[PDB]
Amino acid sequence: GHMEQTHRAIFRFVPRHEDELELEVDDPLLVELQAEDYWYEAYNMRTGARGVFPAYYAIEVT
Amino acid sequence: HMEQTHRAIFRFVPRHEDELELEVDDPLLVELQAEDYWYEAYNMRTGARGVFPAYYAIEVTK
């Protein structure tokens, strides 16, 4: 499927919680949902995993 | 020396019970800089304790 990258990780995020998505710096992300509590629900296009992470760990591609 | 070590730079709304809520500019006393890039802190504004993603705070050169 076409997966349009929306965001890029800028900080390493190591989950402590089951629902979280692990991030490495520069990971390309497809952010599915920017939730009102400043968590993003995303697909990590490097790892193929899905989960949530703190919004400010990723920035928009454009 | 119950003195400020960090300042929050991003809003963090917990999804998980161990987490510390942050508002931008919150002064923090970070007790543990964990190896997994989570910090355990006292929020010197709210009086709450908990963990947050390390890059949501900056050191204060105090």
Residue numbers in the entry:
A (entry chain BBB): 487 to 548
B (entry chain AAA): 488 to 549
Lines quoted from the article behind this entry:
Aromatic residues cluster in the core of folded proteins, where they stabilize the structure through multiple interactions. NMR studies in the 1970s demonstrated that aromatic side chains can undergo ring flips—that is, 180° rotations of the χ2 dihedral angle (Cβ–Cγ axis)—even when engaged in stabilizing interactions in the hydrophobic core. Here we capture ring flipping events of a buried tyrosine residue in the SH3 domain of the JNK-interacting protein 1 (JIP1). Our data therefore suggest that the conformation of the aromatic ring at position 526 is determined by steric interactions dictated by the size of the surrounding amino acids.
The SH3 domain of JIP1 undergoes exchange between two distinct conformations, as evidenced by 15N NMR relaxation measured at multiple temperatures (Supplementary Discussion). The 15N and 1HN relaxation dispersion data were analysed simultaneously according to a two-site exchange model in which a highly populated major state interconverts with a low-populated minor state (Supplementary Discussion). Aromatic 1H–13C heteronuclear single quantum coherence (HSQC) spectra show averaging of the NMR signals of the tyrosine ε1/ε2 nuclei of Y526, which shows that full 180° ring flipping occurs. During the structural transition between the major and the minor state, a void volume is created around the ring of Y526 that corresponds to a pocket expansion of 65 Å3; this is mainly due to the structural reorganization of the side chain of Q520. Notably, the transition from the eclipsed, major conformation to the staggered, minor conformation is associated with a structural change from a rare, classic β-bulge to a common, canonical β-strand conformation. Breathing motions along the structural trajectory between the major and the minor state generate the necessary void volume for fast ring flipping of Y526 to take place.
